[PDB]
Design a protein around this motif. Structure first.
Motif, PDB file in Angstrom:
ATOM      1  N   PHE A   1       0.766  -1.138  -0.083  1.00  0.00           N
ATOM      2  CA  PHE A   1      -0.047   0.056  -0.052  1.00  0.00           C
ATOM      3  C   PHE A   1       0.939   1.339   0.248  1.00  0.00           C
ATOM      4  O   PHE A   1       0.625   1.983  -0.757  1.00  0.00           O
ATOM      5  CB  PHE A   1      -1.059  -0.133   1.140  1.00  0.00           C
ATOM      6  CG  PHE A   1      -2.144   0.870   1.043  1.00  0.00           C
ATOM      7  CD1 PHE A   1      -3.377   0.680   0.568  1.00  0.00           C
ATOM      8  CD2 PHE A   1      -1.918   2.139   1.463  1.00  0.00           C
ATOM      9  CE1 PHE A   1      -4.295   1.330   0.262  1.00  0.00           C
ATOM     10  CE2 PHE A   1      -3.190   3.110   1.413  1.00  0.00           C
ATOM     11  CZ  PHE A   1      -4.206   2.616   0.693  1.00  0.00           C
ATOM     12  N   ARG A   2       1.908   1.142   0.713  1.00  0.00           N
ATOM     13  CA  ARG A   2       2.921   2.278   0.819  1.00  0.00           C
ATOM     14  C   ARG A   2       3.588   2.637  -0.761  1.00  0.00           C
ATOM     15  O   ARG A   2       3.686   3.782  -1.123  1.00  0.00           O
ATOM     16  CB  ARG A   2       3.990   2.263   1.667  1.00  0.00           C
ATOM     17  CG  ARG A   2       5.164   3.405   1.902  1.00  0.00           C
ATOM     18  CD  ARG A   2       4.494   4.789   1.854  1.00  0.00           C
ATOM     19  NE  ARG A   2       5.209   5.741   1.667  1.00  0.00           N
ATOM     20  CZ  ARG A   2       4.810   7.131   1.478  1.00  0.00           C
ATOM     21  NH1 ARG A   2       3.530   7.594   1.308  1.00  0.00           N
ATOM     22  NH2 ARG A   2       5.885   7.943   1.404  1.00  0.00           N
TER      23      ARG A   2
ATOM     24  N   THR B   1       2.100   1.793  -3.450  1.00  0.00           N
ATOM     25  CA  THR B   1       1.071   2.314  -4.345  1.00  0.00           C
ATOM     26  C   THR B   1       0.519   3.648  -3.983  1.00  0.00           C
ATOM     27  O   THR B   1       0.265   4.425  -4.938  1.00  0.00           O
ATOM     28  CB  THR B   1      -0.408   1.513  -4.263  1.00  0.00           C
ATOM     29  OG1 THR B   1      -0.753   1.517  -2.830  1.00  0.00           O
ATOM     30  CG2 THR B   1       0.024   0.033  -4.643  1.00  0.00           C
ATOM     31  N   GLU B   2       0.925   4.077  -2.750  1.00  0.00           N
ATOM     32  CA  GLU B   2       0.748   5.517  -2.170  1.00  0.00           C
ATOM     33  C   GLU B   2       2.051   6.416  -2.918  1.00  0.00           C
ATOM     34  O   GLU B   2       1.706   7.382  -3.632  1.00  0.00           O
ATOM     35  CB  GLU B   2       0.551   5.564  -0.755  1.00  0.00           C
ATOM     36  CG  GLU B   2       0.469   7.181  -0.302  1.00  0.00           C
ATOM     37  CD  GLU B   2       0.364   7.066   1.132  1.00  0.00           C
ATOM     38  OE1 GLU B   2       0.577   6.003   1.720  1.00  0.00           O
ATOM     39  OE2 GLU B   2       0.207   8.230   1.565  1.00  0.00           O
TER      40      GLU B   2
ATOM     41  N   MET C   1       0.677   7.153  -6.316  1.00  0.00           N
ATOM     42  CA  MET C   1      -0.097   8.056  -6.263  1.00  0.00           C
ATOM     43  C   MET C   1       0.298   9.487  -6.288  1.00  0.00           C
ATOM     44  O   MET C   1      -0.277  10.530  -6.563  1.00  0.00           O
ATOM     45  CB  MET C   1      -1.407   7.869  -5.292  1.00  0.00           C
ATOM     46  CG  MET C   1      -1.108   8.279  -4.160  1.00  0.00           C
ATOM     47  SD  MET C   1      -2.585   8.128  -2.952  1.00  0.00           S
ATOM     48  CE  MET C   1      -2.780   6.367  -2.963  1.00  0.00           C
ATOM     49  N   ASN C   2       1.505   9.627  -5.428  1.00  0.00           N
ATOM     50  CA  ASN C   2       2.186  10.814  -5.377  1.00  0.00           C
ATOM     51  C   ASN C   2       2.790  11.411  -6.627  1.00  0.00           C
ATOM     52  O   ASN C   2       2.923  12.770  -6.493  1.00  0.00           O
ATOM     53  CB  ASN C   2       3.331  10.721  -4.190  1.00  0.00           C
ATOM     54  CG  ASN C   2       2.755  10.211  -2.870  1.00  0.00           C
ATOM     55  OD1 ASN C   2       3.496   9.435  -2.139  1.00  0.00           O
ATOM     56  ND2 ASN C   2       1.623  10.896  -2.408  1.00  0.00           N
TER      57      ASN C   2
ATOM     58  N   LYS D   1      -5.366   6.837  -7.680  1.00  0.00           N
ATOM     59  CA  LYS D   1      -5.466   6.276  -6.234  1.00  0.00           C
ATOM     60  C   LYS D   1      -6.223   5.171  -6.266  1.00  0.00           C
ATOM     61  O   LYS D   1      -5.696   4.281  -5.447  1.00  0.00           O
ATOM     62  CB  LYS D   1      -5.657   7.666  -5.249  1.00  0.00           C
ATOM     63  CG  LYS D   1      -4.763   8.678  -5.472  1.00  0.00           C
ATOM     64  CD  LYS D   1      -5.289  10.033  -4.700  1.00  0.00           C
ATOM     65  CE  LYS D   1      -4.571  11.122  -4.805  1.00  0.00           C
ATOM     66  NZ  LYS D   1      -5.195  12.321  -4.220  1.00  0.00           N
TER      67      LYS D   1
ATOM     68  N   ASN E   1      -4.780   1.538  -5.204  1.00  0.00           N
ATOM     69  CA  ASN E   1      -4.905   0.667  -4.230  1.00  0.00           C
ATOM     70  C   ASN E   1      -5.487  -0.716  -4.530  1.00  0.00           C
ATOM     71  O   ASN E   1      -5.234  -1.829  -3.731  1.00  0.00           O
ATOM     72  CB  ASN E   1      -6.353   1.313  -3.295  1.00  0.00           C
ATOM     73  CG  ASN E   1      -5.689   2.758  -2.823  1.00  0.00           C
ATOM     74  OD1 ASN E   1      -4.805   3.038  -2.514  1.00  0.00           O
ATOM     75  ND2 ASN E   1      -6.594   3.612  -2.604  1.00  0.00           N
TER      76      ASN E   1
END
Lengths: 48, 50, 99, 49
Positions: free
Chosen positions: A22-23, A25-26, A29-30, C8, C12
């Protein structure tokens, strides 16, 4: 008892895997944060 | 799919910032230069009557 | 903003799927070692002498099991193998069943 | 880009976690097989006695 210890380690490892995924993927997303390369060029041209 | 949409977003963000750049051209060259030239006159009837 | 939201969401989803990768690896490892253990059990059963030799006959009784253990120790002990031999049930073979 | 660098680093970390999880599951299954063997031996001995 050893089996329970190894199972707890397994569950902790799975939780760490989920957190790391998840980190990651974050971090992906950044990239989408609005990065701006605009107005400055106009003033650069005018100043030159 | 996510990477493709992100690339499109970056392209459109650069487009929007080019638009903002043209807006800045408007603000300075269109107006600040206009104001500078308008006030630089100081109504030359000033120096002329001097 | 809409593209960021979609990115996002998809990201996820990617993270959640990636979580269901190493968990599948854990399941595969457990099942693989189950395979290995059960196959080793089958191989050991195949190796069993199925009571062919008289030492295999010794597997059929507790006292005979002790005799088999003594024979195995004798085999493992050369000093106890030359002087002390296997029982006549093993070492000596009669010509026929009546003999 | 820096977030992508950390993405790569944590991908390496996640792969290491995958390897650790696989090794832990290997150990868990081996100890489970040992438990089954010991329990079967217990059952046989208790039945005989």
């Amino acid at each position: 008892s050893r089996l329970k210890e190894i199972d707890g380690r397994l569950k902790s490892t799975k939780n760490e895997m989920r957190k790391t995924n998840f980190r990651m993927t974050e971090l992906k997303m950044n990239v989408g944060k609005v990065v701006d390369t605009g107005i400055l060029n106009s003033k650069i041209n005018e100043r030159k | 799919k996510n990477d493709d949409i992100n690339r499109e977003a970056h392209q459109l963000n650069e487009i929007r910032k080019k638009y903002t750049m043209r807006k800045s051209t408007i603000e300075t060259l269109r107006e600040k230069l206009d104001q500078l030239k308008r006030e630089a006159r100081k109504d030359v009837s000033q120096k002329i009557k001097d | 903003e809409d593209i960021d939201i979609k990115r996002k969401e998809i990201i996820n989803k990617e993270g959640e799927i990636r979580d269901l990768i190493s968990e599948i690896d854990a399941k595969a490892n457990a099942i693989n070692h189950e395979m290995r253990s059960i196959q080793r059990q089958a191989e050991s059963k195949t190796k069993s002498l199925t009571t062919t030799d008289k030492i295999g006959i010794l597997n059929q009784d507790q006292d005979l099991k002790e005799v088999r253990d003594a024979v195995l120790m004798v085999r493992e002990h050369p000093e106890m193998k030359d002087k002390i031999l296997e029982p006549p049930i093993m070492t000596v073979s009669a010509i026929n069943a009546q003999f | 880009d820096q977030m992508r660098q950390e993405l790569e680093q944590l991908e390496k970390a996640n792969e290491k976690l995958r390897e650790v999880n696989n090794s832990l599951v290997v150990s868990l299954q081996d100890v489970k097989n040992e438990e089954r063997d010991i329990q079967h031996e217990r059952e046989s001995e208790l039945r005989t006695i």
